[PDB]
Each structure stands twice: as C-alpha cells, then as structure tokens.
Design a protein around this ligand. Sequence first.
Ligand SMILES: [Mg+2]
Ligand SMILES: [Mg+2]
Ligand SMILES: [Mg+2]
Ligand SMILES: [Mg+2]
Ligand SMILES: [Mg+2]
Lengths: 145, 228, 88
Amino acid sequence: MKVILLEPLENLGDVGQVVDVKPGYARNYLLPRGLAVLATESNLKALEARIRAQAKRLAERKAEAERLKEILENLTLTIPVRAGETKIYGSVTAKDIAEALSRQHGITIDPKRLALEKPIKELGEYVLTYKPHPEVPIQLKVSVV
Amino acid sequence: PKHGKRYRALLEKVDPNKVYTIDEAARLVKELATAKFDETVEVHAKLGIDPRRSDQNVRGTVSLPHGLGKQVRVLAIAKGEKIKEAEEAGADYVGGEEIIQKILDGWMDFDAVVATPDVMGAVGSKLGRILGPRGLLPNPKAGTVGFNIGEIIREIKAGRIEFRNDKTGAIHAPVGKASFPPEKLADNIRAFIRALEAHKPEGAKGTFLRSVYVTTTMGPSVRINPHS
Amino acid sequence: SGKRPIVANSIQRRGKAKREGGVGKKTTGISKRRQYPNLQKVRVRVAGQEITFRVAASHIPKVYELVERAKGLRLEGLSPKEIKKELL
RNA sequence: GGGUGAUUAGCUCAGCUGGGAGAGCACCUCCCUACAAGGAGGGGGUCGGCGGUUCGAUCCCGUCAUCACCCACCA
RNA sequence: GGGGGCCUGACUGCGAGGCCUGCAAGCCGAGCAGGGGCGAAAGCCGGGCCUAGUGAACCGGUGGUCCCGUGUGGAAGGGC
RNA sequence: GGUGUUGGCUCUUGGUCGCGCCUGCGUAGGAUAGGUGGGAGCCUGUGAACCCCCGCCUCCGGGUGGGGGGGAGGCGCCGG
Ligand SMILES: [Mg+2]
Ligand SMILES: [Mg+2]
Ligand SMILES: [Mg+2]
Ligand SMILES: [Mg+2]
Ligand SMILES: [Mg+2]
C-alpha cells in the first residue's frame, strides 16, 4: 500500500519516502496511531504542494537578505552619545541599537535578531553580526563617539 | 607443480559470457586458440534425455566439404573381391584371415573399419567384445554397409561422425586443422548441425540444446550463445 | 444481513458436482446451496469514539476513503450512531 | 490405464547405491554319547521368465506374468 | 478327408435376382470394371463342408478426406 | 489443504535450477584411469623440480587445493 509517513521509523524509511506496506500494517497500526497517511491522488498533490512551498519559500525569506546584504554592509552606523573618553558613561543595548537606525538611517530591523550577548561599554568603530535569517550572516558596522 | 599459470591467460582477453557474433568472431577466434599446429571445433552439446528408454542408440554419417588431413591407416579386413575394388587410397596390402593375429601379435597400428559384414562369425568371436566401445564394431551405420562400401573409403575423405550420443549427448566436430585457412574454420558449423539435426531421439520432455562452446583441442571455453 | 457500501448480500446460486470426463462424458449431481460474502467488522476512529462496519473485503478501504474524505466535516454533535449514517 | 512395491534354495529370509549365490530350519551319514541338544562333508537354486546398456548385473534400464494397496474411464 | 508348392480374393467400387420374415435384421448370389494370386489352359479366388461362436441406436478415441467452418484469413469443433 | 479477512521480528530445515568448488579405488597396470570426443604438444625464464603449514575426502594408499627465500627444467609421444 503506497502510503507516506511523518515519523521516521527506521524500518520503512525516513519521512517523505512513500512505501508499499502490507495493508494490515497500515490498517491496524499506522494511520490510527498517527504514523502515516493514505497517499491518494488528492493527498498526493496536497502535501506535494506543501513541499512545493517551503522548498520554494526559502526565497522570499532568503534572498530578501541578499538584496540587503551587499547593500547594508556598504554603510556605517554612528551613535553619538556623550560619555567618557576611554569607556562609555552608561551603555548601549541591542534593544536600543535598533532605534538608532530609526533616528538616523530610517530602517526597521529586529533587535534580538542580532548577535550581542552583552552590551558594549567602550568605543571604537566596532562591527557586529546581524541576523535576518540563520543562513546569510551579515556583519554590521557601528561606531560611537 | 599444480595446474599451470597460462590457463589463467587467454580467457582474460576473451570476455566469456557475452556474444561475439560466432561467425565473424571465428576470425579472431583464430588468434584466440594459438594452439600447436592444428585446431578442432568441439561442439558437443548434451541432450535433455536419458541413457535408456529402449535403445535410442543413434548412428549416422556426416558430409564435410574438404576433409580430414593426415591418416587413419584403415587397413580393413575381408576375403574375395572386396579390397580388390578398394585399394586406391585408404586401404593397402591387406591379405586375409592369415593375418588377423597381427592384431594379436604381428603389427599393432590400426584404425578405421570400412569392410563388409561377410565374416562376422570370427571377429564377433575374437574381437566381438574386447573391441568396440573404443569406437568400433563393424556395425551398419558406421562404414560397413554391403557393396555400398564402394562409396565409403573415399567418403572418409568426406565424413565420419559416429552418432554415439550415449549418456552424455557427446558428439564432437574434430575437423579444423588451424592452418587450413580460416575458411575451413568458418563455413561448417551450420553444415555440422545440419547433419546433427537428423535422426534425433524421439519422445523427450526437454530441450535439445546445450553449451556448444565451440572450442579447439586446447582452446578457450565458456559458452558462446548458439544460434547462428 | 449484508449492508454497507458494498451493497452486497447472500445468493442462493446452485452448487453442483460433475465427475470429470470431457474426452468421454461428464457426470451430474446437483443441489441448492448458499453463497455468502466476506463481510467482517471494521473499526475506525473519526476523531471521537470508534465505529464498526460489517463491510465486505471488496470495499474495505472505501471506509478509509470515506474517512479520509470527512476532513472538514462537522463531525461531532455527540452522535456516534448518527455519524455512521452521515458517512456519505 | 495412471505409480510404489515385490519375486532368489523345499521354507522365513540377507546380498550394497556392479563385481564367482549365501546364513539358519528340514533331508543323507559320521562324531561324543542310548536318545537329542551340538559340530564336519556333500548336495541342493532358470536370482519369476525376455531383452538391452556394462569388460562384467541378484542390484542399471524397458515390456510381460502372478499378486497387494490408491484414483477412475467404461457408451 | 490326409501331404507338397506358389500365394493373400479374410480385395476395392458396385451388384441383378431371390430364401426367411411384422420392423430391424439375417442369408445366398451369378454379372462388370481397377488390380492381383494359382494353373500350360478350361477355370477358380468377394474366407474356413455347413448349420452356433454374437449387440440397434446414443456417447466418446485413433487414421485419412476435393467437405462445413459464423465480417475476413488461420485456428478450435463438426461432417464423410 | 489453499486464499482474503492477516500484521510486525526472528532461528532453521528440504528441494528445484545455474555458478563457483570437494570426490570418482577389483586384479592387472607406477598408482586411487568417472564417461564421451579430439589430442601432440603442453607448461615453464610474469616460474617447474628433491626441501616446512594447513584444509577436504580418503579405500593409510594417497587424491585436491592457498601458502615458502630457491630458479631451469617437468608430464604428455610411443612402450606395456
Ligand atoms: Mg578412415
Ligand atoms: Mg558441410
Ligand atoms: Mg448476511
Ligand atoms: Mg477432451
Ligand atoms: Mg484455511
């Protein structure tokens, strides 16, 4: 019986590979226990359209970065903040790093989608690693005075 | 010593289980064999029957375009006007029933039968059991058929072939001779099976096909695919 | 009874006997006998509860067809017997 | 008909996947004992006939014949 | 009736006329052609000196046959 | 008995048909010569013979093979 499973039981294969099984193996086991589906022409091109989505979805969410990767890196970021002259008075936070784009460069980027475990307290034209998607690592240029 | 190391030779350059095309393939079979100063055909093929079922003994004769080559001596045996009309070639200096003890103790160097079943009462007594299964007994369908023997000792120069299929299908085309061009090794497998496809055994549940191979006295082996 | 999408049932069609021949003649022996389908119960879930089907082995998956059809179907209302009836 | 099987002395019987037919009982006699135990000699066979392979058949193979078992095909 | 020789006429295609008799049968049979046996020829040979030694029809096997053979060509089955 | 109801996991066993492999034992005759048909060369200097291990069968006689530095000859003709 041609049926596809969704939990990789290392006896009939990994998820995705349809397999012919004895009907009883499917009648009194899989589908009741939520292991497989009767892959009909309806339930074929059903989920076949699904794999026609996510496998193609990574494009309006993937290349959308590259249309900004080799663009965003071609810029600086300046955060004028009164401070000491070898260590900042206070700090600069990723949460606050984002709106620095809004008060100068007018771009909306996500906070916690940014590699910065701790805040920076000393100056220097430093460069960070922003993430718009865990696939296209972009390095971000910043500076404080 | 053991088994030899050249046997692990020519076969690596033959591709055993394949095709070849048989006919036009014999032309490089010529450089396959490379035996001594000769070559044979060796067809064999084992029947799909049983040694018994009454007595499907089977005998016959073959044609063969050119012929054999060397000698079988023949010698033969009769009494009267028999060898009289048969001594231009294969037979010579026979004598009579005062010589057969040269079979006993005189001249030991004999082969080929012809002759005529005219004095069987004595050879069926003296050589009636202790000679035959080598490939003898005057017999009929074996070069011993009355006055018709007149067209036989020159038919040696044509064909022999004893249809002794026995327990093992057997049969064996032995006329190649290598240096007899390759033509004498190319245009006769068909005319061989044409006489082999003759008085076959009758009533058998199976096939009349096996192996065939076509090999020399010491040539390669491993199948061929028999058809044409 | 027979019931179920098979719409199958029992038939009385005759069972007979003939001692062989054909190269001579063939005998006779008759009687009337009953033929039955191969109906068996069929368990299935459908979200809530189970429900049995005295269906024949011809049209077993038709239920699994029917079930796999009843996706976006208002299936509940606390009505298990009524569900089977509503199964198309 | 289809297939499994036998059959050897007078008898109940071996022979071994091929190579001079044999062990018991019965029959004749000789022994030690008078009987019957028990030994030694000899006779006894168409391996059911007929054939084919085999150098060579009790055995390999194929019909007959007298059985025995099982499944019909007889208008 | 007892011996010997040569043979296959215990042929094929017909077959007038008749015995018996309800039907079906059964029985004898001269005559011709094809071809043959015997005998020098006349001639005889279509089983046996005779009267008993047998089985309608239905069904089916085997061998031949200018036959029929389903839209047509083979084939399958049938028919003589 | 077979099959659908009837599903997962596993151990083993018989046979059929090919392949790669182990054998083939009266005397005589080196000797343990399955059969048939050819067959005089065959192997060998990319490797033989006198020398160590092992396996299988075995008729104690050996038949068959993967192994060792050694490196020029050994079986077949024929006889019997
Ligand atoms: Mg000759
Ligand atoms: Mg020819
Ligand atoms: Mg019912
Ligand atoms: Mg029939
Ligand atoms: Mg059952």
